[PDB]
Ligand binder design. Structure first.
Ligand SMILES: COc1ccc2ccc(=O)oc2c1CC=C(C)C
Ligand SMILES: COc1ccc2ccc(=O)oc2c1CC=C(C)C
Ligand SMILES: COc1ccc2ccc(=O)oc2c1CC=C(C)C
Ligand SMILES: COc1ccc2ccc(=O)oc2c1CC=C(C)C
Lengths: 608, 102, 212, 63
């Protein structure tokens, strides 16, 4: 047992000559132990029992400038005993770290030279790492590289080691690990913005994709059910989703694996066909329904300025919902006008009064049906999930009112009033469309209500604070405390100015209340001009684009099926051999990038 | 500039008329009864506090709670207009009104 | 380095990682494990924590004469060590401090003019006032005796003691049978609502309502 | 700064055996025959790429 631990110690340092004579001793140990035929005896003297770590692992963990010599002795020692398969393709047996497979250690240590020696000796390059570390539950506990040595080479930015693993034979690029991912999911899962990551994930997305050459490995689904495009939308990875929707590839043998085709270019004027294969609400999932109908992520305003998205909101707005939302705004406005008229103002009823009551009864039931579905189908209540509730509340209280007339209760009158008063509250909820009404959203009005209530929380204290001193100079407090805030309203009192005890002290106490309240009132305007002005003007412009983008998608589900067949965005275009894709046309003019045009579909530039 | 200010005041009135009608229907229930009460509502902002309609037969503590929320929420909307003018109007028109004057 | 406020030379003490093998002991910010882009770093707290007589916390925080205290408190074994103390001590205690002082000033105005064998909720309410105000005079009486400074928090230790002593001085005047049992107790209650405004040092929304 | 005084003033208000229970940081063997009360801060760095030669615990697991 001393001989075992000296091997792990000498491997940990650069002790080359000590490691040789230990192997010369251990080979002499096998000559006296010929009876077991040494499969397991050679493993047991070079691998810890509980953790399963090998001596070949132990050298690659502790990188020293003698590491290149320690491994080539160990691999030559494994070759003499013909155990090189079990000695290289060995793995941990812990609860974590399951199958770490020392090839993945060398790839982690950024040692490409010792990497090639393992691969040439045979390292089983698709060796899946599992365990709770590499598949972490919390983000800081581990690192989710993608459970593949091919994945870790590109995820930890090692381009030359991406080349060595991929050009190997049995790499199996389209493998699925636990959680079901590809390599392309693992690159999408692990990315950030241009800060903190200088574009390596974008080009490691690229280099793996050209050598694949097919539509599997980007139309493959994980266990959740998503493609690497859809999973780039759900996690909110911004600049890796710019690369999917604008992946123009000018190489001739594989031009099919591309979006943003160029239809015709003439000098500085070029017509570019973006692609909408899964970037449009015509399937079950889409990149629109995953970006727009989502609250948990962040960052939705940045992904909605990407070009096959941002145009596709605008084309849907110009032909659907600039008509429908103005038609929605009128029918709900004529609804609340009709409520207050037939309530208290005005069998065989009057003809304009009967048709007006007919308009209310059918329409309010339609809101309870429509908003009753949207609640049942569905944190969220901060953005638009609360606004689906209140129209249903306004719908049900009108319906609950007339039901109380069937049960003959007194609350036919009072509950119908509360429905009408809440009805005018939701006409304020049609201010999500108007750009001038962006500063009257609820997000700003919540912050202002936060800043007024804390001012009242100051003011009530100074109302009580000075007021106790008012109660001493003469309920005596309940008379005096009413005089105090009505003084700010403008009720100056003369008889309580003429106090029996200390009239000059109460006059001094009155003038300090007027000044200190005028200090606190100025102290509120500093709080609003200092903080509220800058950040909300950044926030209320980003929440206005997003609240419109939900109303465009919600209206499209309100259209019938054969209306979406008529109203169709994009055209079919032959972008490759035997291929047809529904594609958006965006015409752009570029004057700085000058190049001859070799990647163009249509030779004749005419819009025909 | 005076068109932009008139745009920003009329949309504030378009908020204020709704909250004039919105709270006012709840005023009409606590007792034209609305046309008497809706005149009392904006004159309260002018400074006409009324004592007899404060003493309602039905729920005087509820109508007093309804009155104090109208004064606060109007004071919220009035502050919400000054944020709209200090946020947007200040920078762009000072670029625009100097270019339209030349 | 803490007492004189030298900033960037104190960044070097708390983040002195030394990768050389023969002397790695003379180091802080040890790296416990690194795996690719994810690394776990152990900073050191040998004298950077309130467990000895002096510390880098008691010299940075309890100090007014220097300058620059907000920059030294964003250094990493300091800034985390305030936050970990906040998450497990004083987000509970300062909210417990805010309620017991709020129920104190509510109880003062009720038993003063509004409302032997007294009433049972009135007797227990008066019992809560008598013991607690004496605790403030004991607690803030120490903090004045132990200790320019009055610009930051040394004045705020005074006023709670003033509110404590005037309630105690009031009931002592009832023993000497003076007329000022009534008037001085009122000035204690009015100054009592002034110090509930002095619990606005915690709330970030109440940062614009400070005294500065 | 005014919050940072209220955190330190409250810690002197705790009893002695409460600060023994509430303790920040753990003991870790950072060198030969050395033990220091140390705070753990996990950070993620993507720009500085280097092989790792200065590391205490070989097995990366939070155990
Ligand atoms: C009116 O069309 C819309 C609607 C909503 C959004 C929301 C996000 C966004 O950033 O862009 C949008 C557009 C595009 C506008 C123009 C003028 C091309
Ligand atoms: C276009 O019609 C609209 C417009 C707007 C809304 C607003 C909320 C809502 O829940 O329902 C709406 C409907 C559907 C009503 C009918 C009668 C089919
Ligand atoms: C709430 O914890 C505190 C408390 C006080 C201070 C004072 C100085 C400072 O700069 O940082 C502080 C933090 C850290 C906050 C976070 C969110 C890590
Ligand atoms: C947690 O208890 C608190 C909380 C806050 C304060 C505020 C100032 C102060 O001087 O004293 C305080 C005490 C101590 C009171 C007792 C009864 C031991």
């Amino acid at each position: 047992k001393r001989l075992k631990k000296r091997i792990f110690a000498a491997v940990s340092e650069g002790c080359v000559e000590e490691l040789r004579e230990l192997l010369q001793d251990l080979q002499d140990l096998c000559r006296r132990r010929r009876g077991l035929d040494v499969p397991d005896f050679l493993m047991h003297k070079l691998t810890a029992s509980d953790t399963g770590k090998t001596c070949l692992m132990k050298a690659l963990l502790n990188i020293n400038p003698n590491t290149k010599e320690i491994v080539r002795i160990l691999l030559a020692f494994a070759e003499e005993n013909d155990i090189l398969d079990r000695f290289i393709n060995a793995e941990y047996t812990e609860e974590a770290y399951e199958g770490q497979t020392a090839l993945n250690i060398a790839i982690e240590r950024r040692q490409g030279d010792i990497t090639a020696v393992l691969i040439a000796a045979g390292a089983d390059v698709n060796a899946h790492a599992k365990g709770v570390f590499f598949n972490p539950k919390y983000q800081h506990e581990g690192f989710y590289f993608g459970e593949t040595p091919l994945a870790l080479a590109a995820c930890t930015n090692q381009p030359e080691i991406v080349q060595l693993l991929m050009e190997n034979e049995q790499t199996d690029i389209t493998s699925q690990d636990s959680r079901g991912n590809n390599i392309l999911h693992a690159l999408v899962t692990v990315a950030e913005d241009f800060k903190t990551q200088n574009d390596f994930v974008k080009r490691m997305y690229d280099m793996i994709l050209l050598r694949s050459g097919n539509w599997e490995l980007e139309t493959m689904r994980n266990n959740d059910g998503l493609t690497p495009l859809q999973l780039a939308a759900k996690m909110g990875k911004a600049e890796i989703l710019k690369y999917i929707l604008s992946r123009e590839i000018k190489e001739k043998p594989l031009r099919s694996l591309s979006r943003k085709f160029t239809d015709w270019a003439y000098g500085p004027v070029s017509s570019s066909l973006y692609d909408l294969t899964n970037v449009d609400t015509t399937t079950d999932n889409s990149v629109l329904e995953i970006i727009v109908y989502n609250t948990n992520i962040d960052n939705r305003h940045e992904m909605l300025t990407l070009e096959p998205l941002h145009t596709l909101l605008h084309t849907k707005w110009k032909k659907f919902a600039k008509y429908m939302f103005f038609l929605s705004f009128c029918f709900y406005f004529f609804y609340n006008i009709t409520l207050t008229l037939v309530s208290y103002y005005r069998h065989k009823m009057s003809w304009l009064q009967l048709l007006g009551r007919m308009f209310v009864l059918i329409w309010a039931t339609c809101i309870s049906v429509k908003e009753g579905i949207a609640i049942f189908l569905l944190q969220s209540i901060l953005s638009d999930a609360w606004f689906h509730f209140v129209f249903f509340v306004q719908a049900v209280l009108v319906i609950l009112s007339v039901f109380l007339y069937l049960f003959a209760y007194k609350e036919y009158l009072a509950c119908l009033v509360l429905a009408m008063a809440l009805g005018w509250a939701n006409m304020l909820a049609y201010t999500r469309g108007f750009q001038s009404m962006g500063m009257y959203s609820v997000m700003i009005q919540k912050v202002i209500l936060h800043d007024v209530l804390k001012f009242l929380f100051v003011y009530i204290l100074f109302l009580l604070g000075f007021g106790v001193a008012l109660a001493s100079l003469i309920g005596s407090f309940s008379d005096a405390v009413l005089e105090l805030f009505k003084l700010t309203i403008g009720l100056g009192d003369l008889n309580i100015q003429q106090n029996s005890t200390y009239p000059i002290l109460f006059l001094f106490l009155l003038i300090t209340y007027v000044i200190l309240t005028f200090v606190l009132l100025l102290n509120m305007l500093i709080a609003l001009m200092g903080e509220t002005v800058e950040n909300v003007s950044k926030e209320s412009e980003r929440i206005w684009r997003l609240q419109r983008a939900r109303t465009i998608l919600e209206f499209e589900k309100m259209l019938p099926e054969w209306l979406r067949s008529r109203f169709r965005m994009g055209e079919l275009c032959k972008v490759a051999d035997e291929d047809f894709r529904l594609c958006l046309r965006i015409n752009e003019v570029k004057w700085t990038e000058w190049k001859t045009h070799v990647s163009f579909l249509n030779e004749d530039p005419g819009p025909i």
